[PDB]
Amino acid sequence: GEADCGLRPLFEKKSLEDKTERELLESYI
Amino acid sequence: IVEGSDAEIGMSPWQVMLFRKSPQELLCGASLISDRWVLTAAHCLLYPPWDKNFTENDLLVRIGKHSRTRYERNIEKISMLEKIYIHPRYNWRENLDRDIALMKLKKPVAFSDYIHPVCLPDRETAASLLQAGYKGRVTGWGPLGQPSVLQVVNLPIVERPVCKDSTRIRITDNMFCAGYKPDEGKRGDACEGDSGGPFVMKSPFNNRWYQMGIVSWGEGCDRDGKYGFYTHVFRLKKWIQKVIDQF
Ligand SMILES: *[C@@H]1O[C@H](CO)[C@@H](O)[C@H](O)[C@H]1NC(C)=O
């Protein structure tokens, strides 16, 4: 709860991207 | 979730589901912020006009789930509740201001590939991510035919003035709204059963997911031209910390 928070074992922890996360990051203008 | 797509396995490992014990029914979404603490909407636990006033023993949470109906052997965990804390200033009569509750698990849940906590935002993350047009993500098993697996939508935060004109309710700075305009750039949305669930955002600066909002009130998957409202988690962060430190 805060050290490892927000880093998904099956995504960030593996350098894997989910299918729609780009849509979020692209939105940050 | 309406107009979403299928979430991937492990994509939302802080997703927690609130159930009524008896009879078994899915009440709300919720989120995992540590091995013992679960954040949700107050209206998921206390809503007097609908005779809703749950104690701990009325409820359970299931964590690490993906398929609504399939039992996920060695993946999913079930937990009972030690204590429920609803914000003392939660305004159920008028506008659901401060629609926030915390739930303490009887026993710590073990983290795994499928169960993992989301971050609470810090000031800098609130200041830079919480902008009109920036997109967040909502996940859930709200009715829109009902989801087989966990559904995901990504929704833009709406400008405060557009939020204000969208409803007759007296909105407050403790809430924000999100959704696509009645025009069209998609038409996704959280629904009734997604309430309590997290509105998350990913930080480009550090690659972490932060819970910026809690899905507030919804009825059906129909908001009649309106936008869903979200409890502003950073503004209620001191309260969250106060409850956790004392209890
Ligand atoms: C809900 O139930 C508890 C326990 O019986 C009671 O103390 C409380 O007054 C109720 N609260 C509301 C707002 O109805």
The structure tokens 């993500």 sit at B137
Tokens linked to A7: 């880093």
Method: X-ray
Chain A CB contacts of B133 below 8 Å? 27, 29
Instruction: Output the CA B53–ligand 1 centroid distance in Å.
Output: 6
Put residue B218 in one of left, alpha, beta given phi > 0 → left and psi -120 to 50 → alpha. Answer: beta
Cβ distance A29 to B133 less than 8 Å, yes or no, reads: yes
The distance of Cα B108 from the centroid of its chain, to the nearest Å, equals 20
**What resolution, expressed in A, was reported for this entry?**
2.4
- Alpha-carbon distance B4 to nearest alpha carbon in chain A (angstroms): 11
Cβ contacts of residue B25 below 8 Å, gap of 6+?
Answer: B19
The answer to whether the CB of B13 falls within 8 A of the CB of A12 is no
Domain that residue A4 falls in = 1-29
What is the C-alpha separation between B13 and B76, in angstroms, rounded? 11
Task: Report the residue among B45, B52, B53 best suited for mutation to probe ligand 1: largest number of ligand atoms under 8 A from its CB.
Answer: B53
Given this chain, do its domains B1-12+118-234 and B13-117+235-247 carry the same CATH topology?
A: yes
The three-point CA angle B179-B155-B134 to 5° equals 105
Concatenate the DSSP letters of all residues of B207-245 into one string.
--EEEEEEE----TT--TT--EEEEEGGGGHHHHHHHHH
B54, B21, B84, B115 alpha-carbon torsion, rounded to 10°: -150
Tokens linked to B76: 């999913």
Active site residues of B: 43, 99, 195
Atom 6 of ligand 1 has which residue's CA nearest to it?
A: B53
What is the C-alpha separation between B160 and B75, in angstroms, rounded? 41
Q: Say yes or no: B199 contacts chain A, CB-CB below 8 A.
A: no
Tokens linked to B106: 């009887």
Cβ distance B116 to A8 less than 8 Å, yes or no, reads: yes
CATH topology of domain B13-117+235-247: Thrombin, subunit H (2.40.10)
Instruction: Please give the CATH architecture assigned to the domain spanning B1-12+118-234.
Output: Beta Barrel (2.40)
- Alpha-carbon distance B17 to nearest alpha carbon in chain A (angstroms): 18
Kindly report the CATH number assigned to the domain that includes residue A16. Answer: 4.10.140.10
β partners of residue B202: B209
- Alpha-carbon distance A15 to nearest alpha carbon in chain B (angstroms): 11
Residues 210-229 of B with CB under 8 A from A: 210
Domain layout of chain B by residue ranges: 1-12+118-234, 13-117+235-247
What is the C-alpha separation between B28 and B140, in angstroms, rounded? 9
Atom 10 of ligand 1 has which residue's CA nearest to it?
A: B53
What is the C-alpha separation between B121 and B168, in angstroms, rounded? 30
Q: Structurally, how many domains does chain A consist of?
A: 1
Cβ distance A20 to B152 less than 8 Å, yes or no, reads: yes
Tokens linked to B31: 């989120």
